[PDB]
RNA sequence: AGGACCGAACCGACUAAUGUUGAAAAAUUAGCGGAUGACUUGUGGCUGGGGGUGAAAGGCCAAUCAAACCGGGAGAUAGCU
RNA sequence: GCUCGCCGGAAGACCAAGGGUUCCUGUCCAACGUUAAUCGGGGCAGGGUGAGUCGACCCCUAAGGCGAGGCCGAAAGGCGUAGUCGAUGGGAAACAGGUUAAUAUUCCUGUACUUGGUGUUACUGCGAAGGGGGGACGGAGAAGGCUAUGUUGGCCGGGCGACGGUUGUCCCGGUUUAAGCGUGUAGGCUGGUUUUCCAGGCAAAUCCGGAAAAUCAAGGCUGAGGCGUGAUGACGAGGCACUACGGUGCUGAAGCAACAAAUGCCCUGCUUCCAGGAAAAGCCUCUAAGCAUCAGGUAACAUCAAAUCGUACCCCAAACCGACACAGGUGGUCAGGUAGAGAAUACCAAGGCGCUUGAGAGAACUCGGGUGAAGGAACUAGGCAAAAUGGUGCCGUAACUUCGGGAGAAGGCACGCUGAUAUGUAGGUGAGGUCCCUCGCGGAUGGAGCUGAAAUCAGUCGAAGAUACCAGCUGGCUGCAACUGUUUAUUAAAAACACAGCACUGUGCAAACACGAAAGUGGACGUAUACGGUGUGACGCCUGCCCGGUGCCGGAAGGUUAAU
């Protein structure tokens, strides 16, 4: 549900929040919390590989089940989450056996649904299965890129994929880019899109709600100096010149993709 | 059990002062002066041993060597350790 | 107003001292120039 | 509830005066801005010179920065004084 | 020694960091102290730092470092696994009084507590490099119960006043007591107990997790404070005496109650919010190999052990960082009285200082201030600087607006003291006495005593009652920037930078990109509602024409074209 802040002082005049009354309001599940410590964009040489990256609000590491592998075992939705790892929101569920696990959040998942993966699930929202299985045309989500790796494409807040066609050992995606890319029919896949399709329509209203998640302000190319960046330099405004990223490669259409190992997947490419 | 030969290297000299004095005839406590790498068992062994006297406690502090100045030479003089004994009661000690 | 030198025996220790100097090959190098030299005393190191 | 209001510690330095061989190689007095936050601070660590870091002034990197400091090539070269 | 002045949320007291004998005593003034010097943080000599409980060492990890093997790299070397370091965080235990010239939670007296060995007795499933719990965690806000502490009354000891009055509703001082043990309270959390079964916790498990069934609403965990004990003790205003006038010795009364109240404690709580809030060990429990009446485990008692290093002194400064005995800089802890909303501000207590040249004189001129006839910005680049406004309650408040603001708009009234309402009110706190109870740190009634605003009426003094310090000047038009922030440490705080928002573009995951000859790492344990780059900068109305030039994207039939 969203939510518009009244404008009692600037920072908060334009903030639209958007609250979920279904949310656990407690702490997150114990055995399956772990340490998620910050890096400031710096990589193992110390050096900045990625700027505007430090600071903001701790967080801790949530372990999701992106494999799915617990299979022919029934479990029940004990309750949904917040996850600061991601945009999507994140449910705790138990299964029969009483081993409790993290699955991203499905559209229509409330408190008490029952969900299962394997080859012989029942076809509704939140059930895991081989697509080989699922009938074509099916949006899906958290959907493998190998068999059994895990979850890799379309697991944001409100993202899916549909399955468009299948020619033998491989089937046809068109995934949320707008592109169609090839995969292998044993790549598990889960019914249904992901919950929290309005986290989108939120607005952060100031420039400290971005600070809390760990994102430090960005420079325009045009107001620094001929030494830091191409686009430096002037008495004014001055930007003569076609835009270019800070190391010299340019940015207004010039394609960057080298990989001509996966191409062979890639149907037609995006819109 | 320490050596006997380590007990007759222990002890160095009787510290003398008004302090030691005062605390000989109130507190029943001597104060030696002893090695430097003495642990407070060592001490308490020696006394009980050479000088024949029932040992209750030994408190131990170092003494940092001042720096002194010989003409125009910046010297210092050596660290020291210091053993308060304190004897048993009843006991007598010259 | 804050000077440069804010002392600190263990940031002293770590970044000048013998360990760290012998913790290199360019330490050691440092180690074997003032030794050829004479120095008095090698290191920070008290 | 709030990068909300008035206002101390704390952080900063807008205006004027003094001081400019100063009490001080940038501070003092009277005013001033923030003062639950993009705040401030203690301890320890990481990023090294054509390199770092920068809410971006070519700013800062030990009173030194349009390329630090120390040693070496090195008694560089100097149609100049 | 007697007066005077200054700080007193510090200019007082205790630490960490840093310094390393600057601490205390005797002695000296050549050199150091911006002057003299018998004095000193100066010279010389002697003395002074006492720990099972404070801190370090030790057990455990974060960021990060090193890194057996390993991968990569002309060599040097880079990254990294198992490990192993690294506090600024987690882990066992001591308080009160007295004493030294200098140490004291360390010495002495009185009263405790903790962890390990051994040794006798009683009891019996013990055992981890493994599993679970716990340690274990965010920001803000609101009460309620307390305490440190303070005020007043009572009690005890002393006093009857250098000058009018002072046997009383008078004055001065004291009225203090801890750790531990027992009680488990105000209050917080959770339904307990037994039996059966199970694809989970890499194997097992009686433990954790999940399903049923039966039984009982009352069991368990956490918890400040109070009370009893510790304590027939210590301390205690003062007296009695010596003295090197420094101090030492002996004795010792009252030692209660009410009220106010923290930023400290219950509280690692409760409510609520999104930005969703370390790890590991100690500790409790479970079993696998193994150990089979052995080893081990837990309960009592006795005995032994708790080593080593630091402990003086400065620590918002004359001892640290600034070349100085330097108007500078430095983190944490304690927080008294009156007025005040207050840790602001003024004056004081405990405590500590008067800032290491003084003495005159009272010229111009310079610095920091006070006042000013008549005029009120005529000064000046500019009301720069001074001057002025300043608190609380109440009446009242415009354009414009994104309906929140503007707004404390502007402008104005009341304010001291005394009496009556009420010899102290409304409110707060709450004793005796009565009743009930599952009986205790219980509950209803009950109002003694204590504390205590605010308002109305009448009266009274001054020119002036927010009387001092403290403490908005106000309004109108307009350019720029939405705003709070950030910036040229040391001549520029702004219209510059940043910002949420908008748009374009790249990127399908072994992603683009970046640091790396490379391995790899960040991005990210993220997945197009994401991440990076570029331009623009909230919001309202919008973003129109041009692909000729230079880039970029798509196409490959033709011309031209390298190595081979």
Known sequence: ?271 | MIREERLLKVLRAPHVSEKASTAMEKSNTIVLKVAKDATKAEIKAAVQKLFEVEVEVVNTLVVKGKVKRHGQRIGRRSDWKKAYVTLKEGQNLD | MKRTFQPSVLKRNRSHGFRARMATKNGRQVLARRRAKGRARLTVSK
């Not at chain 1, 990256?53 to 075992?73: E, L, P, T």
């Open chain 1, 1 to 271: 549900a969203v939510v518009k802040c009244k404008p009692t002082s600037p920072g908060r005049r334009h903030v639209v929040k958007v609250v979920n009354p279904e949310l656990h309001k407690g702490k997150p599940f114990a055995p399956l919390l772990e340490k998620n410590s910050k890096s400031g964009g710096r990589n193992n040489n110390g050096r900045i590989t990625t700027r505007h990256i430090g600071g903001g609000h701790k967080q801790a590491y949530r372990i999701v089940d992106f494999k799915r592998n617990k299979d022919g075992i029934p479990a029940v939705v004990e309750r949904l989450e917040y996850d600061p790892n991601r945009s999507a929101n994140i449910a705790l569920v138990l299964y029969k056996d009483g081993e409790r696990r993290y699955i991203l959040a499905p559209k229509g998942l409330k408190a008490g649904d029952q969900i299962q993966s394997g080859v012989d699930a029942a076809i509704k929202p939140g059930n895991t299965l081989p697509m080989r299985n699922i009938p074509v045309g099916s949006t899906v989500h958290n959907v493998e890129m190998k068999p059994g790796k895990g979850g890799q494409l379309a697991r944001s807040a409100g993202t899916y994929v549909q399955i468009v066609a299948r020619d033998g050992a491989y089937v046809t995606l068109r995934l949320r880019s707008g592109e169609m890319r090839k995969v292998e029919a044993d790549c598990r896949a889960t019914l249904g899109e992901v919950g929290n399709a309005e986290h989108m329509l939120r607005v952060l209203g100031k420039a400290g709600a971005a600070r809390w998640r760990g994102v430090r302000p960005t420079v325009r190319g045009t107001a620094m100096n001929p030494v830091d960046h191409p686009h430096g330099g002037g008495e004014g405004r001055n930007f003569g010149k076609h835009p270019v990223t800070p190391w010299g490669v340019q940015t207004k259409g010039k394609k960057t993709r080298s990989n001509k190992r996966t191409d062979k997947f890639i149907v037609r490419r995006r819109s």
